[PDB]
Curated annotation (Swiss-Prot), chain A:
Lineage of the species this protein comes from: Viruses, Varidnaviria, Bamfordvirae, Preplasmiviricota, Tectiliviricetes
Assigned keywords, A-Z: Capsid protein, Virion
GO aspect biological process, one term: viral capsid assembly
Function, as annotated: Minor capsid protein essential for stable capsid assembly of complete particles.
Entry GO terms, CC: viral capsid
Tree of life domain: Viruses
The protein's assembly and partners: Dimer.
UniProt xrefs under InterPro entries: Tecti-min-caps
Subcellular location: Virion
One Pfam family cited in the UniProt record for this chain: Tecti-min-caps
The protein's name in its UniProt record: Minor capsid protein P30
UniProtKB/Swiss-Prot annotation, chain B:
Its job: Major capsid protein self-assembles to form an icosahedral capsid with a pseudo T=25 symmetry, about 66 nm in diameter, and consisting of 240 capsid proteins trimers. The capsid encapsulates an inner membrane and the genomic dsDNA genome. The major coat protein P3 and two assembly factors (P10 and P17) are needed during the assembly of the virus particle inside the host cell, when the capsid protein multimers are capable of enclosing the host-derived membrane, containing the virus-encoded membrane-associated proteins.
Name the UniProt record assigns to this protein: Major capsid protein P3
Native organism: Enterobacteria phage PRD1 (Bacteriophage PRD1)
TM region(s), chain numbering: none
Coiled-coil stretches noted in the UniProt entry, renumbered to this chain: none
Subcellular location: Virion
Subunit-structure text: Homotrimer.
Signal peptide limits: none
Amino acid sequence: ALINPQFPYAGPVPIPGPAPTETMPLLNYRVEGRIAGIQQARQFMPFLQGPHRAVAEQTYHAIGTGIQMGQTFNQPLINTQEG
Amino acid sequence: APATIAAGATGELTMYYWVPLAYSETDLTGAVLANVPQSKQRLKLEFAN
């Protein structure tokens, strides 16, 4: 702010002001609020809580069976070298 | 197989197929242990008609 003498800035907005209204009042709000609809315990989703496999491992079962059977052919006898 | 079989003719054909179990003569991947214990193998063949 600058004040300049001799033209000085009025020393106030004075008493000639026009009170325009008495509408100043905010009427307090008084209220009762009830949000009470029956609630049912459940919601349907496509899927909740699953941690789906991105790849599975290979998996398997097992079997064996049979017996011990055989047809054989042997090497001929040979002269013994030494000993 | 004869390239063509003319009207009234009879042609003779020969075909061979190798049904593999083992991958090759040196790679036994896929081979089947069939020791003589009696549960049977089944080789099903459907021919032309």
